[PDB]
Design a protein around this ligand. Structure first.
Ligand SMILES: [Mg+2]
Ligand SMILES: [Mg+2]
Ligand SMILES: [Mg+2]
Ligand SMILES: [Mg+2]
Ligand SMILES: [Mg+2]
Ligand SMILES: [Mg+2]
Ligand SMILES: [Mg+2]
Ligand SMILES: [Mg+2]
Ligand SMILES: [Mg+2]
Ligand SMILES: [Mg+2]
Ligand SMILES: [Mg+2]
Ligand SMILES: [Mg+2]
Ligand SMILES: [Mg+2]
Ligand SMILES: [Mg+2]
Ligand SMILES: [Mg+2]
Ligand SMILES: [Mg+2]
Ligand SMILES: [Mg+2]
Ligand SMILES: [Mg+2]
Ligand SMILES: [Mg+2]
Ligand SMILES: [Mg+2]
Ligand SMILES: [Mg+2]
Ligand SMILES: [Mg+2]
Ligand SMILES: [Mg+2]
Ligand SMILES: [Mg+2]
Ligand SMILES: [Mg+2]
Ligand SMILES: [Mg+2]
Ligand SMILES: [Mg+2]
Ligand SMILES: [Mg+2]
Ligand SMILES: [Mg+2]
Ligand SMILES: [Mg+2]
Ligand SMILES: [Mg+2]
Ligand SMILES: [Mg+2]
Ligand SMILES: [Mg+2]
Ligand SMILES: [Mg+2]
Ligand SMILES: [Mg+2]
Ligand SMILES: [Mg+2]
Ligand SMILES: [Mg+2]
Ligand SMILES: [Mg+2]
Ligand SMILES: [Mg+2]
Ligand SMILES: [Mg+2]
Ligand SMILES: [Mg+2]
Ligand SMILES: [Mg+2]
Ligand SMILES: [Mg+2]
Ligand SMILES: [Mg+2]
Ligand SMILES: [Mg+2]
Ligand SMILES: [Mg+2]
Ligand SMILES: [Mg+2]
Ligand SMILES: [Mg+2]
Ligand SMILES: [Mg+2]
Ligand SMILES: [Mg+2]
Ligand SMILES: [Mg+2]
Ligand SMILES: [Mg+2]
Ligand SMILES: [Mg+2]
Ligand SMILES: [Mg+2]
Ligand SMILES: [Mg+2]
Ligand SMILES: [Mg+2]
Ligand SMILES: [Mg+2]
Ligand SMILES: [Mg+2]
Ligand SMILES: [Mg+2]
Ligand SMILES: [Mg+2]
Ligand SMILES: [Mg+2]
Ligand SMILES: [Mg+2]
Ligand SMILES: [Mg+2]
Ligand SMILES: [Mg+2]
Ligand SMILES: [Mg+2]
Ligand SMILES: [Mg+2]
Ligand SMILES: [Mg+2]
Ligand SMILES: [Mg+2]
Ligand SMILES: [Mg+2]
Ligand SMILES: [Mg+2]
Ligand SMILES: [Mg+2]
Ligand SMILES: [Mg+2]
Ligand SMILES: [Mg+2]
Ligand SMILES: [Mg+2]
Ligand SMILES: [Mg+2]
Ligand SMILES: [Mg+2]
Ligand SMILES: [Mg+2]
Ligand SMILES: [Mg+2]
Ligand SMILES: [Mg+2]
Ligand SMILES: [Mg+2]
Ligand SMILES: [Mg+2]
Ligand SMILES: [Mg+2]
Ligand SMILES: [Mg+2]
Ligand SMILES: [Mg+2]
Ligand SMILES: [Mg+2]
Ligand SMILES: [Mg+2]
Ligand SMILES: [Mg+2]
Ligand SMILES: [Mg+2]
Ligand SMILES: [Mg+2]
Ligand SMILES: [Mg+2]
Ligand SMILES: [Mg+2]
Ligand SMILES: [Mg+2]
Ligand SMILES: [Mg+2]
Ligand SMILES: [Mg+2]
Ligand SMILES: [Mg+2]
Ligand SMILES: [Mg+2]
Ligand SMILES: [Mg+2]
Ligand SMILES: [Mg+2]
Ligand SMILES: [Mg+2]
Ligand SMILES: [Mg+2]
Ligand SMILES: [Mg+2]
Ligand SMILES: [Mg+2]
Ligand SMILES: [Mg+2]
Ligand SMILES: [Mg+2]
Ligand SMILES: [Mg+2]
Ligand SMILES: [Mg+2]
Ligand SMILES: [Mg+2]
Ligand SMILES: [Mg+2]
Ligand SMILES: [Mg+2]
Ligand SMILES: [Mg+2]
Ligand SMILES: [Mg+2]
Ligand SMILES: [Mg+2]
Ligand SMILES: [Mg+2]
Ligand SMILES: [Mg+2]
Ligand SMILES: [Mg+2]
Ligand SMILES: [Mg+2]
Ligand SMILES: [Mg+2]
Ligand SMILES: [Mg+2]
Ligand SMILES: [Mg+2]
Ligand SMILES: [Mg+2]
Lengths: 386, 136, 78, 59
RNA sequence: GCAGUCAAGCGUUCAUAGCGACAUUGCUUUUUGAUUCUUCGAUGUCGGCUCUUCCUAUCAUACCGAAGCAGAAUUCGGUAAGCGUUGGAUUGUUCACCCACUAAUAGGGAACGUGAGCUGGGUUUAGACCGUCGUGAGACAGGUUAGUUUUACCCUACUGAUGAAUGUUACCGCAAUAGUAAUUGAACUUAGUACGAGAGGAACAGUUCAUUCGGAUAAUUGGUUUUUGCGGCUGUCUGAUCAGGCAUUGCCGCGAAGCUACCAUCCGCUGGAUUAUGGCUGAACGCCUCUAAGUCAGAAUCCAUGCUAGAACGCGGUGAUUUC
RNA sequence: GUGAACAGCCUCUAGUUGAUAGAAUAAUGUAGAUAAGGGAAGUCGGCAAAAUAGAUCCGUAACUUCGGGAUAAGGAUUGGC
């Protein structure tokens, strides 16, 4: 017949299929355009999502009814100890797309990455890379030939980095390895940079800075098998209805005589890949800085960790990125921060922030105190104690 | 919102869907206001239009002077009850739902407003500012 | 940035946090949480609820060093 | 411009009944009292002016 | 039902801005008839709920050409279905008809979409009242009230989920093909300006917000409570006390964690090619013409960028590869 | 025992402890509950659900066959010692 009343579809066809992602490490499907005039640097970074908290800052938006007033804002924090560089991989342009032609590895590989190449570490003879490592013995010659080849050919150079998971409260020991496109100028300069950085270490301040707009690439929280109502935001059917009501009443017309790809159905929910963009960096933390969670306006020596510590995560004892708002994925997940694909002029992006205050109270209840110092002050002396 | 509303308004939690009755908080003779429409509200199958603080509604007077009853007129929501959240981080709420009868341009029919008035409404409708005591 | 305080319980309310209630008169009451908030709606009297400041004050609990002497005076002669 | 009044506590303003012989009120008539706004005795950034008296001289 | 051709007329004058008689040529298959091919060893009526997709004869939104276009508003026409198209009162209704919001509240198809998807109000069995007709049993395309809505575990489709074999195993990647997404409004300002005798009265650039939609997220606030976590209460049972049992989780206030809400917060990209249309140069046709050759500018379109899958019979780089 | 009580709930005497079992706790169900702000806007229709409730005291309309309507309506109160 014809609908009756018009309404928009439930849910976005551009995020199909709604199946579980192929890996907890969401893929970077694109990197920034290359500007080979600038210095060589990474274009993304690995970290772990730890938690959120609240911020207060004064706003700067000439014209807003909130210009020059304080706002309070949710932000998230991602643990970010220096990534360590261990390979370069060199790609070439073909009429069938980008194809990698070599990979050169550092001579010494940390147990952390080595562990990544294995399914049962405890039993294994840990032989990974033990013949590659030899290639260095000899003067250096075949590793030069490779490095050399990459320079000769190669349209784009990526770096194999991995995270220092041990520098993180996680149990999980096996580190995360991944390719990061290098955008500083000249294919040769790029590989030189790469080669120079083997076994050597790279920190976030070398990649991100205050007020930058960055993207988060990560696998979404999982939910298992979801009915149609919650998964697609379909209307609940009425109370009166027999044989269940969190459903879709009509699964299709009679012709085409086939349930169609575009109707909502029960199925997996969450644990999807997502490339969320335009998240402002409101803080770039330093792990060797007491007074991490302190401010120009605050002053009190205290770190970003909440009282009792980040619920379900732990402590934060390294550099971190504090991103305004909230990000795909959950507490503990490997998450990739990426440079933005365009130069946003937004004004909203561009505004330069300065935190006045960072919340620091326990998130494990309705916290009343920032430091244990403050808590003793307000509360008095207790039956434990002095 | 709309006519005579100088200013924009930041979104605030919708408290009052159509059918809701708020206290009349002016001295017009009206005792309550029954909401039949919100101005500037959009469309989605099955959704009630619903007002908030400093929204202009279209109401009738269920209780009040007979010269005010049996007809539809503009009013402005001045107090809420559904809690909402300001950009200074605060979740706040009044003890009653209440608004004041008004003209399309936004002029009060009455001359006083009894009780407090949320600032977001005061900021929105100058003749409401005028007649307000305690704001927020 | 001001740290307001719980008009039921006496707690510090750091920014964006708990709720604010504007009563009939226009008396504003600020709560740190649903607890102070509910005890409040329940017409509970804070001086009878052991954990509140107000209750502690009235019952002279753990003050000790405030009612312990200080030292603040001078001597001129010009 | 509202004056602080020792003894209130409070970092806010309140309205008090005031009497003969008191701060922030000079009565117009015998046994007149006025309900008047007054500022708390606890310093905040809402003050235009702090009033201090030197007790010890510095270096 | 929709759309043309002729052009007598209408339109102050003026056929064709906008219309159009007498005639006349068509198109459509959500009208209704006409037919009786299929189905009477059965293809479950009407409406509404829900949900998808498609058509265009386009209501809104983008860009345009016309005007009996000064401005504002409106009317006519093109490219256009990318994207929207609602909340109520009465009625079983579809339809109708008012109220009200709105950018707009377009029209249609999909077995007059959609009952092992719902509902069961109407229609259409058996009870029953009335009116009309009948001697009567009974009838009525008249009114009224009450009247059981069955089955999926199969196949396919669809949604998600594993997985043998292409030496083994592991890590990092490519990208064919497929999907794809954002939408609309207001205020400030431009500006009481352009236009106008006046009454009136815009727009581009800039700013702040908002609607509808989408993807997440849980600092905060709120909801949930078998944290049976802490406290309280009734009845009884353990001789009292302590401390407990039982009352299908006995009851109550608070209640962390988790889940979760436009009831909460955050985020939703920018290049090219084009349509209509306005043009350049320019012959045909010594004049003239945006067009024939060649060519510029151009839209909510399109193709990319970007975003989601990743071919389980598409592929690359790399690690280690067993001997009693 | 509680209580108006052969009600409900708890207990003594007697009698049972029979009803396939284990591991998890997805969708959708069945049965049991709760929800901020609004309050029937849902729907043929308030269907379902919620609200009310004992007892003591106060107070109680139209209309009526004078018998009622009437727990009309509407209020207060209730433990322990
Ligand atoms: Mg339609
Ligand atoms: Mg409708
Ligand atoms: Mg890509
Ligand atoms: Mg504003
Ligand atoms: Mg690639
Ligand atoms: Mg090779
Ligand atoms: Mg293992
Ligand atoms: Mg799960
Ligand atoms: Mg569920
Ligand atoms: Mg049923
Ligand atoms: Mg549905
Ligand atoms: Mg489908
Ligand atoms: Mg742990
Ligand atoms: Mg918490
Ligand atoms: Mg928590
Ligand atoms: Mg009044
Ligand atoms: Mg509806
Ligand atoms: Mg009446
Ligand atoms: Mg509320
Ligand atoms: Mg006045
Ligand atoms: Mg005032
Ligand atoms: Mg609560
Ligand atoms: Mg809570
Ligand atoms: Mg037609
Ligand atoms: Mg004429
Ligand atoms: Mg003419
Ligand atoms: Mg003609
Ligand atoms: Mg013809
Ligand atoms: Mg024909
Ligand atoms: Mg036909
Ligand atoms: Mg028709
Ligand atoms: Mg036949
Ligand atoms: Mg037939
Ligand atoms: Mg048959
Ligand atoms: Mg059949
Ligand atoms: Mg059938
Ligand atoms: Mg049958
Ligand atoms: Mg003319
Ligand atoms: Mg004109
Ligand atoms: Mg006009
Ligand atoms: Mg045309
Ligand atoms: Mg055109
Ligand atoms: Mg379409
Ligand atoms: Mg199409
Ligand atoms: Mg739309
Ligand atoms: Mg309608
Ligand atoms: Mg209706
Ligand atoms: Mg009529
Ligand atoms: Mg209109
Ligand atoms: Mg048909
Ligand atoms: Mg049908
Ligand atoms: Mg069917
Ligand atoms: Mg059936
Ligand atoms: Mg029926
Ligand atoms: Mg029936
Ligand atoms: Mg019958
Ligand atoms: Mg009949
Ligand atoms: Mg019937
Ligand atoms: Mg019956
Ligand atoms: Mg049925
Ligand atoms: Mg079966
Ligand atoms: Mg089947
Ligand atoms: Mg399948
Ligand atoms: Mg073999
Ligand atoms: Mg002006
Ligand atoms: Mg004027
Ligand atoms: Mg004129
Ligand atoms: Mg998110
Ligand atoms: Mg959601
Ligand atoms: Mg509870
Ligand atoms: Mg208990
Ligand atoms: Mg109790
Ligand atoms: Mg007892
Ligand atoms: Mg004792
Ligand atoms: Mg027992
Ligand atoms: Mg029992
Ligand atoms: Mg129970
Ligand atoms: Mg849950
Ligand atoms: Mg919001
Ligand atoms: Mg949303
Ligand atoms: Mg945005
Ligand atoms: Mg995008
Ligand atoms: Mg192109
Ligand atoms: Mg040209
Ligand atoms: Mg020309
Ligand atoms: Mg010629
Ligand atoms: Mg052309
Ligand atoms: Mg041409
Ligand atoms: Mg030609
Ligand atoms: Mg677009
Ligand atoms: Mg781009
Ligand atoms: Mg992508
Ligand atoms: Mg293939
Ligand atoms: Mg494959
Ligand atoms: Mg297969
Ligand atoms: Mg290939
Ligand atoms: Mg391969
Ligand atoms: Mg290979
Ligand atoms: Mg008994
Ligand atoms: Mg059995
Ligand atoms: Mg049993
Ligand atoms: Mg079992
Ligand atoms: Mg369930
Ligand atoms: Mg509710
Ligand atoms: Mg409530
Ligand atoms: Mg009510
Ligand atoms: Mg209704
Ligand atoms: Mg009503
Ligand atoms: Mg309805
Ligand atoms: Mg209905
Ligand atoms: Mg009915
Ligand atoms: Mg009806
Ligand atoms: Mg009925
Ligand atoms: Mg009712
Ligand atoms: Mg029913
Ligand atoms: Mg019922
Ligand atoms: Mg209740
Ligand atoms: Mg009665
Ligand atoms: Mg009563
Ligand atoms: Mg007593």
């Amino acid at each position: 017949s014809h609908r009756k009343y018009e309404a928009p579809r439930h849910g976005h066809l551009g995020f199909l299929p709604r199946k579980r992602a192929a890996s907890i490490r969401a893929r970077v499907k694109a990197f920034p355009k290359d500007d080979r005039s600038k210095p060589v640097a990474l274009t993304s970074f690995l970290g772990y999502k730890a938690g959120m908290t609240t911020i207060v800052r004064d706003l700067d938006r000439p014209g807003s009814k909130f210009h020059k007033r304080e706002v309070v804002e949710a932000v998230t924090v991602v643990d970010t100890p220096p990534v360590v560089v261990v390979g370069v991989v060199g790609y070439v342009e073909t009429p069938r797309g980008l194809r990698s032609l070599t990979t050169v590895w550092a001579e010494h590989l940390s147990d952390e990455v080595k562990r990544r190449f294995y399914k049962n570490w405890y039993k294994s003879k840990k032989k990974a890379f033990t013949k590659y490592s030899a290639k260095y013995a000899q003067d250096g010659a075949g590793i030069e030939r490779e490095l050399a080849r990459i320079k000769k050919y190669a349209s784009v150079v990526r770096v194999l980095v991995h995270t220092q998971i041990r520098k993180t409260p996680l149990a999980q020991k096996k580190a995360h390895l991944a390719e990061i496109q290098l955008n500083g100028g000249s294919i040769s300069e790029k590989v030189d940079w790469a080669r120079e950085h083997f076994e050597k270490t790279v920190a976030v301040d070398s990649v991100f800075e205050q007020n930058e707009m960055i993207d988060a690439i990560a696998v979404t929280k999982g939910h298992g098998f979801e009915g149609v109502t919650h998964r697609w935001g379909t209307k609940k059917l009425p109370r009166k209805t027999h044989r269940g009501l969190r459903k879709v009443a009509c699964i299709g017309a009679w012709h085409p005589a086939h349930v169609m790809w575009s109707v909502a159905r029960a199925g997996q929910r969450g644990y999807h890949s997502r490339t969320s963009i335009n998240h402002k960096i409101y803080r770039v933390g330093k792990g060797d800085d007491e007074a991490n969670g302190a401010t120009s306006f605050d002053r009190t020596k205290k770190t970003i960790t909440p009282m009792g510590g980040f619920v379900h995560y732990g402590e934060i004892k390294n550099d971190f990125i504090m991103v305004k708002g909230c990000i795909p994925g959950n507490r503990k997940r490997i998450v990739t921060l990426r440079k933005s694909l365009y130069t946003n002029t937004s004004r909203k992006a561009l505004e330069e922030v300065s935190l006045k205050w960072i919340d620091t109270a326990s998130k494990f209840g309705k916290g009343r105190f920032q430091t244990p110092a403050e808590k003793h002050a307000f509360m008095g002396t207790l039956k434990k104690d002095l | 919102s709309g006519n005579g509303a100088q200013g924009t308004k930041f979104r605030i939690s919708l408290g009052l869907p159509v059918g809701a009755i708020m206290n009349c908080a002016d001295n017009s003779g009206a005792r309550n206001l029954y909401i039949i429409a919100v101005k500037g509200s959009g469309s989605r199958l099955n959704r009630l239009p619903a007002a908030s603080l400093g929204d202009m509604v279209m109401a009738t007077v269920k209780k009040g002077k007979p010269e005010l009853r049996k007809k539809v007129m503009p009013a402005i929501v001045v107090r809420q009850a559904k809690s909402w959240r300001r950009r200074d981080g605060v979740f706040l709420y009044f003890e009653d739902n209440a608004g004041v009868i008004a003209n399309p341009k936004g002029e009060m029919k009455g001359s006083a407003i009894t009780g407090p008035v949320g600032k977001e409404c005061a900021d929105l409708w100058p003749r409401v500012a005028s007649n307000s005591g305690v704001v927020v | 940035m001001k740290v307001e305080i719980d008009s039921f319980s006496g707690a510090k309310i750091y920014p964006g946090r708990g709720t604010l209630f504007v009563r009939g008169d226009s008396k504003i009451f600020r709560f740190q949480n649903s607890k102070s908030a509910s005890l409040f709606k329940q017409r509970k009297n804070p001086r009878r609820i052991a954990w509140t400041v107000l209750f502690r004050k009235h019952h002279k609990k753990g003050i000790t060093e405030e009612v312990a002497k200080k030292r603040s005076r001078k001597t001129v002669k010009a | 411009g509202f004056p602080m009044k020792q003894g209130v506590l409070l970092p806010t303003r309140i309205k008090l009944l005031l009497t003969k012989n008191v701060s922030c009120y000079r009565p117009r008539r015998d046994g007149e009292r006025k309900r008047k706004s007054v500022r708390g005795a606890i310093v905040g950034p809402d003050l235009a002016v702090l009033a201090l008296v030197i007790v010890k001289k510095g270096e």
